[PDB]
Amino acid sequence: DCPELAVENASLNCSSSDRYHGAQCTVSCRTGYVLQIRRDDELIKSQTGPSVTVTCTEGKWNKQVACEPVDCSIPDHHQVYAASFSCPEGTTFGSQCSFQCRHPAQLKGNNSLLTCMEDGLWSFPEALCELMCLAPPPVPNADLQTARCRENKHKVGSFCKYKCKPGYHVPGSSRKSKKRAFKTQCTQDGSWQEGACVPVTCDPPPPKFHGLYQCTNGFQFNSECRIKLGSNVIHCRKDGTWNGSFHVNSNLKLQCPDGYAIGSECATSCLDHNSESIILPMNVTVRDIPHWLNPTRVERVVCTAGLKWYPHPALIHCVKGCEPFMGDNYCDAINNRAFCNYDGGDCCTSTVKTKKVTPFPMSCDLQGDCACRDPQAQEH
Amino acid sequence: PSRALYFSGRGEQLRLRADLELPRDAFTLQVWLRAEGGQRSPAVITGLYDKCSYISRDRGWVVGIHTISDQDNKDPRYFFSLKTDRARQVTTINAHRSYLPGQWVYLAATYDGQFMKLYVNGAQVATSGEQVGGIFSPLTQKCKVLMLGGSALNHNYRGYIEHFSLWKVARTQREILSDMETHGAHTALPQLLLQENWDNVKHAWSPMKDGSSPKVEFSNAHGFLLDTSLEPPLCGQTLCDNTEVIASYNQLSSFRQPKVVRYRVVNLYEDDHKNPTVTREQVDFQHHQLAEAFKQYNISWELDVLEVSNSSLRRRLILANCDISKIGDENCDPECNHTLTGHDGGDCRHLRDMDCNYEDGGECCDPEITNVTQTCFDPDSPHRAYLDVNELKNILKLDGSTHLNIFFAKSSEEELAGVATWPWDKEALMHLGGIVLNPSFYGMPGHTHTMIHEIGHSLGLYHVFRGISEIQSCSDPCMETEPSFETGDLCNDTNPAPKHKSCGDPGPGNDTCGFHSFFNTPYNNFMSYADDDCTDSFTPNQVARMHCYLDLVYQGWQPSRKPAPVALAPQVLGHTTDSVTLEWFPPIDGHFFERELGSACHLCLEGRILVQYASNASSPMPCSPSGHWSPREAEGHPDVEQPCKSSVRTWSPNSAVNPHTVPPACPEPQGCYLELEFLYPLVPESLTIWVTFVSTDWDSSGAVNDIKLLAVSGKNISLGPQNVFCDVPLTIRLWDVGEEVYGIQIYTLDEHLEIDAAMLTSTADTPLCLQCKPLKYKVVRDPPLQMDVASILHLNRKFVDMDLNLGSVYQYWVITISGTEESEPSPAVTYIHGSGYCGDGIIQKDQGEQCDDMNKINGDGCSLFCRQEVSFNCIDEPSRCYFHDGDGVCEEFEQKTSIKDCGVYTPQGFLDQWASNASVSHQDQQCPGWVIIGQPAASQVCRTKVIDLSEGISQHAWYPCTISYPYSQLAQTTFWLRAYFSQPMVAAAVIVHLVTDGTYYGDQKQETISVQLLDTKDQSHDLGLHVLSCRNNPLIIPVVHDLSQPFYHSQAVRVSFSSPLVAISGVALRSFDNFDPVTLSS
Amino acid sequence: KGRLSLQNTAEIQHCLVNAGDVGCGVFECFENNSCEIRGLHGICMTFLHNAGKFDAQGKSFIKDALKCKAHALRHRFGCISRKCPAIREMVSQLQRECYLKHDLCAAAQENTRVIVEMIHFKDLLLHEPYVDLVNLLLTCGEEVKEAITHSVQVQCEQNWGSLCSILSFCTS
Ligand SMILES: [Zn+2]
């Protein structure tokens, strides 16, 4: 004779008064509870469904059923956008979870609780964290053309147009063309995208009185350049116009026609044409350059006032010059540097039509000498 | 009236206006759509997408057309996906058939909260019950938008949309069927949200601000109320393989009237009229013997011997079964083995001038040195010795429309004659079709009956051993193990037979895959391979087919002016208290006009529409500068038996090359092209192209790169690239073509594209069918009608009569007169004015009606002969039907048929026992070990290259979760499923049910599991290893045991595998329910 | 084995139209063929494996020669007769007209030691393009021919002793 069986969270609507060999009893779980079966002894099975039939055999029941609760998932995403979930009890049926929005996201809605419903899923969020970007940082040297941008209420993806004040401009255009209009928009994170106006650099002088020049502010705005009639003061106005021009080696070889006399350009080249000379005055040698450094091309040294005090043909270093391997879909480890324009972009996958990189020697390691070290590619 | 939107693929799509409250909890879509041929792969019809969110863009629901095998895009089905905001997995519901590209489909999808269902043409097709709850929160009601005909990612739709309708509540199948018959003339309801018939699009819909609204046309969905198209069976080929058309030629005897069929004999001579191919006494002996064997079957042959004299054709060898590729290929073959073929060019002789000619560079082929016919076998020579018969018919260019051509060919094989042409081939009436015979057997007294066998192949009769001998695999769709009208020979009288040569019933053998003892085999029939003496007569069910193809395809051969009869009985559509409305089918050959020779009246359709195929085809040679060879297999009506497997009856860009030449790739900016030309240039309305085979990958999105329509005035109107499908023919609708088009050019970039045919449908009223006089139908009654009613002739197929009495029977048959000549009558329909019929909607099982709705349409679950369809089930008194293979509920009838829905089918001599107390190794919180117990649900579909298993699989299955992907591949561990059992029985078979094969998306290496076995107080008895397959999803592992070794009472089964992706849902143990071999061998 | 039919022509054609002409992908697709014309892939790997010892004139020659060989193979492998003598003829013709028009003699005269210390004698007895490069290399300079024969004479003692008595038995 079988013992009386009680199974938690169910409904034992069976009337086996005598629990003999053949005590046919039925077990059905309640709402929000699924059925687990850990059988003991059985011959054949049938698809009962959400319920089950448990039979007595030799003083024991043939099944050991248990209505375990349904398991809602731990809420990671897909319920509230950009919020943190802190369930204090658990992730079973009847449990309720509380969520709080991130710092720059106001909440709209009275009820902010997620309930693990009877279907095994979370409930609908009655309150949604409204994502609104805050007030922008006031960028100096800019005109706030959009009147709403001085407030704090801005929708995500707004278009605030900032026009730079005169004497300043957004970077991108040189000293010839002036552009001062740029767009800053609210990101999906909730912060405004960064953008600022830089001052317009005053125009460089002719090299006749360079080296002994003493500008008041240098390359900054309103810089009056005058050495220690003509142009006694040079006014760097808002357009940057120069009102008046200034008024009065063993390896490297240069043969100027004037020589010690002034006014003539000199042909600047090394002993071998494979090398290129560059101006490196800040105690940086030929081999001491990094790959991200961008030195300038050699300027033909015009004779200034007195003796040339421009970087001396000695300060000018003949370095390993570029080679005609640009843009042929082949990456060169020698030309994998910013000086030779990153081999025309051949060493970076985003600037090759074959969408691949092929190092010229088989040995070259793909993360070593012949790697895409250009930040202007799609790798960053 | 009723107006529809033609959506092109160019970017036309719409958007529902903001004033409509979208359905939140339950909804019902009801759209009449006519899709075109080749859509895009994910192409949608109506979606409800999320536009204010970025965490998941796959919310809401989408109804559309998408292929279920996305790796190959083979068969495109209608689909209905749904993902609520609460749920975690988007579940799709497909259809049961590849869609029809030219029919109006009442696609309707409903969702109530628990079960989402899809209704294609009123029948419930597939139902899934995974999505629960409302499909969005009411807080985000203003954020959801509804798009019609496309999405924001531009899954554009190519076709028509006729009557869009959206509901705020879920309507069951009785309301869906009521909405089909009432169309869009519907009153206002609170539940009816949007019910749009396109008379003012801008009132409720707004297009994209950058795109354009699709153009509004005129079209009618209710164009036919009786479906005139009958599908041939699963191994038939024409209209007369249908079960109820061949039966009407068997019961009736006025369809087997005496017919005189003309035929010709192509007799070749030299330029002096002295030496024949067949002598005059051979022709005279054959024809009297030919009419002797057919005079008892009402078939008479009128002989017209044609003699053509050409000494170039006569002196050389003519062969039939010898292919031209194997002459250049070095693989030997018996069909090309002659002194006039060079013994296949030396490729068949045992030794590998007469003996030095084996493929002398034109020295033995030039006529100035020696005769060409002696020792020249060059396959590209202008003059050669062997001549294929398909070239011979091209040389003669005879007429096949008014005669049956018989050619002659000597062959080394000669066990049969040459290959006769079936009536369903494209060359049935062309000049390249006919019967090729052996000229030295035609008329000889020992082999007279081999012409009767070749005649019957040319009139639609298969071999008697087609259902047994000509079976390529025992898993065939039809294999004649039982006599039936749809299996094997398609004749009920012909018992199954194997391939035999001796007379009488054959001895038993293991060659037959499903039978051992054949009784009363048709040894006496002509279709067997028996000798002349034992072949005497045709079965009387092989003269129903012979008298049918002389009405369907071969009307032009016979000089009788009697038109083709209506081979099907009239059908009753509806009735009232006074009148009964009946419609009938068009006559059996399908022509809707009088057969007037020298015109286009053999091509027009009902409503003055000219439909024509490609007449002349040209394409440039790939290995020549100015080749321009003319392909032939891309001309006529499309004939491919398997429409996705590559065949030989299509045009391929690499088919034009020599077999000894590397094929070149097609050029980049325009590609290789095929230039088809149509016989009658018309103002086109639609263009359908049967692209059969596409390579599995393409660079451009469309396989057909460009299509340019030619014109008589030279203006090449170009069309864009189209996305073609393997099965469905590509169909293009052509607007604003004001110039007549005489042909198309199909530029392609795929190397192995296989264009099969083309079709240019003309406009609504073509100026070429205007001189065709229509044929008129007259309907007679068995109690005869009045002279005011029975005299008149019905141009339409619709007839009504008013004088009826409520008790008496009435038989109606319709004759189909053309001019003065009246055809044979149709089979009669027995009608009583009080009782029912096959469209009443009251199912009366005494008359044989298995189902009865009012559709009279074969596309639903109930046919127009009151028969339920293949894999359908009808469950109401007006017989609404549903598709039961994919539903989640098992029934009593479904247990023996669907293993994938009613569990594993235990054999009648055995008994299944499923596992209990099953223990595993890597048990965790995510995947526990109690899931193996009991019978698994078979509704879990197989996983094709599963990458991630983060969904809810472990609640209904088991795969290891502690060891992830990288540690399992590197360290090479092992996992086991040490399953126990409860009742100790012996092992006859071990069943293991898997939800996946373990195949990874990246790793394509096959992985193997081990099925061991454990018992009481001993070690084991190994059963071996087995690989995993989805079609073998219940992997039955047969136990190997020898009767000399004493038996063992099995207790446990252990399954071990090292790959992490193999998932086990439940193991079993099949035993003997008859006897126990332990107490027997105690 | 006289036909390339045993290896699918589509397999070698699809790989060729899938690959690029810049690297050694064309010869990688080409090497598994029914005829035994193996050896172009080894030449590509050896030329792109020891590119460091080549001067700028030599590296430019190697780049342009492998580019022309890949492009010419993908171009004229379109239509050809399918027989191994014809495949050998088109391969040797494309290799010869590729090396002659990009100044192989200049690359031999500039840096001879790197180009002659790459004989690969054991590979040569079973790779026809290696024999093609050998019989095109020696026609430029006399000291190049004498040095490469001096290396081969030691490589006889490495590999085969009969060749040292066959090849030295000339003009006597
Ligand atoms: Zn036959």
Q: What is the DSSP string of B857-881?
A: -TTSSB-TTS-B-TT-EE-SSS--E
The answer to whether the beta carbons of residues B901 and B887 sit under 8 Å apart is yes
The token pair that represents B718 in the structure block: 């170009």
Q: Does residue A101 sit in helix, strand or coil?
A: strand
CA distance B440 to B438: 6
* A218 CB-near residues (< 8 Å, 6+ apart): none
B673 bridge partner residues:
B747
Instruction: Give the residue before each break in chain A, using a C-to-N cut-off of over 2.5 angstroms; say none if it is continuous.
Output: 228, 248
The answer to whether the beta carbons of residues B958 and B993 sit under 8 Å apart is no
CA distance B368 to B857: 71
A353 bridge partner residues:
none
The answer to whether the beta carbons of residues B620 and B672 sit under 8 Å apart is yes
CA distance A209 to A227: 7
- The CA B421 to ligand 1 mean position distance, Å, reads 11
B814 bridge partner residues:
B779
The verdict on a CB contact (< 8 Å) between B930 and A36 is yes
Query: Could you confirm whether B849 is annotated as catalytic?
Result: no
Q: CA nearest B443: which of B662, B209, B267, B643? A: B267
Q: What residues of A are in contact with residue B913 (Cβ under 8 Å)?
A: 43-44
CA distance B429 to chain A (A): 54
* B735 CB-near residues (< 8 Å, 6+ apart): B215
CA distance B306 to B289: 20
The token pair that represents B612 in the structure block: 């024509």
In terms of C-beta distances under 8 Å and separation of at least 24 residues, what long-range contacts does C88-91 make, across chains too?
C88/C35, C88/C37, C88/C128, C91/C37, C91/C40, C91/C128, C91/C129
CA distance B1014 to B247: 60
Query: Choosing from B196, B454, B480, B486, which is the catalytic residue?
Result: B454
Question: H or E element: which one contains B647?
Answer: none
Residue from A362, A364, A365, A370 to probe the interface with C (highest C Cβ count within 10 Å): A362
The answer to whether the beta carbons of residues A275 and A320 sit under 8 Å apart is yes
CA distance B563 to B561: 6
Rounded to 10°, the helix C40-47/C128-137 angle is 60
CA distances from B358 to A263, B316, B341, B1072 (A): 89, 18, 9, 67
Backbone angles phi, psi at B93, to 5 degrees: -125, 125
In terms of C-beta distances under 8 Å and separation of at least 24 residues, what long-range contacts does B828-834 make, across chains too?
B828/B569, B828/B782, B829/B569, B829/B570, B829/B571, B829/B572, B829/B582, B831/B572, B831/B580, B831/B582, B832/B807, B832/B808, B833/B575, B833/B580, B833/B804, B833/B805, B833/B806, B833/B807, B833/B808, B834/B806, B834/B807
Q: Which CATH number fits domain A83-131: 1.20.140.10, 2.60.40.770, 2.30.40.10, 2.10.70.10?
A: 2.10.70.10
Rounded to 10°, the helix C128-137/C142-159 angle is 140
Residue from C45, C53, C59 to probe the interface with A (highest A Cβ count within 10 Å): C59
CA distance B956 to B493: 52
A163 bridge partner residues:
A143, A181
Is A109 in the B-facing interface, judged by CB distances under 8 Å? Answer: yes
Q: CA nearest B541: which of B496, B485, B497? A: B485
For A206, other C-beta atoms within 10 Å of its C-beta total 11
- The CA B642 to ligand 1 mean position distance, Å, reads 22
Query: Which residue is it, tokens 């030799």?
Result: A58
The answer to whether the beta carbons of residues B1024 and B1011 sit under 8 Å apart is yes
Is A77 in the B-facing interface, judged by CB distances under 8 Å? Answer: yes
Is C60 in the A-facing interface, judged by CB distances under 8 Å? Answer: yes
Helices first, then strands: H and E counts in chain C: 11, 1
Is A113 in the B-facing interface, judged by CB distances under 8 Å? Answer: no
Q: Which amino acid is at C160?
A: W
Rg (CA), chain A: 39
CA distance C112 to chain A (A): 19
The answer to whether the beta carbons of residues B907 and B147 sit under 8 Å apart is no
Q: CA nearest B675: which of B634, B714, B638, B703? A: B634
- Sort A53 into a burial class: Cβ within 10 Å, 0-12 / 13-18 / 19+: middle
- Dihedral of CA atoms C148, C149, C150, C154 in degrees, nearest 10, equals 100
CA distance B930 to B746: 60
What pairing do the DSSP bridges indicate for beta strands C80-81 and B1034-1038? unpaired
CA distances from B156 to B4, B98, B148, B205, B806 (A): 17, 19, 9, 17, 56
- Sort A88 into a burial class: Cβ within 10 Å, 0-12 / 13-18 / 19+: exposed
B104 bridge partner residues:
none
Give the total residue count for chain B: 1082
What distance, in Å, lies between the first and last C-alpha atoms of chain C?
41
Q: What residues of A are in contact with residue B24 (Cβ under 8 Å)?
A: none
Q: What residues of A are in contact with residue C59 (Cβ under 8 Å)?
A: 325, 360
CA dihedral sign of residues B292, B293, B297, B299: negative
- Residue span(s) of chain B under CATH 2.60.120.200 come to 3-218
The token pair that represents B821 in the structure block: 């000549």
DSSP B90-139: -EEE--SSPPPTTS-EEEEEEE-SS-EEEEETTEEEEEE----S-SS-GG
Cα angle B839, B843, B845; round to 5: 125
B817 DSSP assignment: E
Give the largest Cα separation in chain A, rounded.
128
A159 bridge partner residues:
A185
Residue B960 has, within 13 A of its CA and on its CB side, a CA count of 23
Residue B360 has, within 13 A of its CA and on its CB side, a CA count of 8
Q: Which amino acid is at C63?
A: K
For B660, the closest of C14, C77, C82 (CB atoms) is C82
B281 bridge partner residues:
none
The verdict on a CB contact (< 8 Å) between A356 and C23 is yes
Cα angle B1060, B1062, B1067; round to 5: 135
CA distance C86 to C62: 26
* B475 CB-near residues (< 8 Å, 6+ apart): none
Backbone angles phi, psi at B244, to 5 degrees: -95, 5
What pairing do the DSSP bridges indicate for beta strands B435-437 and B405-408? parallel
Is C141 in the A-facing interface, judged by CB distances under 8 Å? Answer: no
CA distance B746 to B752: 14
CATH topology of domain B910-1072: Jelly Rolls (2.60.120)
For B970, other C-beta atoms within 10 Å of its C-beta total 8
* A88 CB-near residues (< 8 Å, 6+ apart): A97, A98
- Residue span(s) of chain B under CATH 2.60.120.260 come to 910-1072
CA distance B360 to B370: 11
The answer to whether the beta carbons of residues B554 and B433 sit under 8 Å apart is no
The token pair that represents A249 in the structure block: 């080696």
Instruction: Name the interface residues of A facing C (CB cutoff 8 Å).
Output: 274, 323-325, 328-330, 354, 356, 358, 360-363
For B789, other C-beta atoms within 10 Å of its C-beta total 15
DSSP B1047-1073: P--EEEEEEEE-STT--EEEEEEEEES
Query: Which residue is it, tokens 């979208």?
Result: B22
The token pair that represents A297 in the structure block: 């091309």
Q: CA nearest B199: which of B185, B178, B212? A: B185
- The CA B465 to ligand 1 mean position distance, Å, reads 10
What pairing do the DSSP bridges indicate for beta strands A181-185 and A159-164? antiparallel
Architecture of the domain spanning B604-762: Sandwich (2.60)
What pairing do the DSSP bridges indicate for beta strands B989-994 and B1034-1038? antiparallel
Rounded to 10°, the helix C40-47/C56-76 angle is 150
Question: H or E element: which one contains B196?
Answer: strand B192-197
CA distance B752 to B738: 34
CA distance B471 to B469: 6
CA distance B299 to B554: 13
What pairing do the DSSP bridges indicate for beta strands B717-719 and B704-709? antiparallel
Q: What residues of B are in contact with residue A78 (Cβ under 8 Å)?
A: 55-56, 85, 88
CA distance A357 to A371: 9
CA distance B888 to B882: 12
CA distance A115 to B300: 86
Residue from B930, B993, B1069 to probe the interface with A (highest A Cβ count within 10 Å): B930
Beta strands in B672-823 (DSSP E): 672-682, 684-693, 704-709, 717-719, 730-733, 741-748, 754-762, 776-781, 798-801, 809-817
Burial C134-146 (b: 16+ CB within 10 A, else e): bebbbebeeebee
- Residue span(s) of chain A under CATH 2.10.70.10 come to 83-131
Q: CA nearest B677: which of B758, B739, B768? A: B758
Burial B436-457 (b: 16+ CB within 10 A, else e): bbbbebbbeeebbbbbbbbbbb
B906 bridge partner residues:
none
Q: What residues of A are in contact with residue B85 (Cβ under 8 Å)?
A: 78, 124
The token pair that represents B339 in the structure block: 């002194």
CA distance B530 to B534: 6
Question: H or E element: which one contains B339?
Answer: none
DSSP A199-249: EPPPPPPPTTS-SS--BSSTTSTTPPB------SS----TT----S-----
- The CA B457 to ligand 1 mean position distance, Å, reads 7
Cα angle B1064, B1066, B1069; round to 5: 125
The answer to whether the beta carbons of residues B990 and B1053 sit under 8 Å apart is yes
CA distance A274 to chain C (A): 10
Q: Which amino acid is at B451?
A: M
* C118 CB-near residues (< 8 Å, 6+ apart): C46, C50
Quoted resolution (Å): 3.8
Q: Enter the CATH code of domain B3-218.
A: 2.60.120.200
B345: left (phi over 0), alpha (psi -120 to 50) or beta: left
Instruction: Give the residue before each break in chain B, using a C-to-N cut-off of over 2.5 angstroms; say none if it is continuous.
Output: 352, 359
Could you tell me where the DSSP H helices lie in A232-367?
341-344
- Dihedral of CA atoms B937, B943, B949, B954 in degrees, nearest 10, equals 10
For B96, other C-beta atoms within 10 Å of its C-beta total 18
Rounded to 10°, the helix C9-18/C56-76 angle is 130
3-state secondary structure B990-1027: EEEEECCCCCCCCCCCCCEEEECCEECCCCCCCCCEEE
CA distance B784 to B791: 11
Could you tell me where the DSSP H helices lie in chain A?
341-344
The token pair that represents B909 in the structure block: 């001599």
The verdict on a CB contact (< 8 Å) between B665 and C13 is yes
Architecture of the domain spanning A142-199: Ribbon (2.10)
Is A6 in the B-facing interface, judged by CB distances under 8 Å? Answer: no
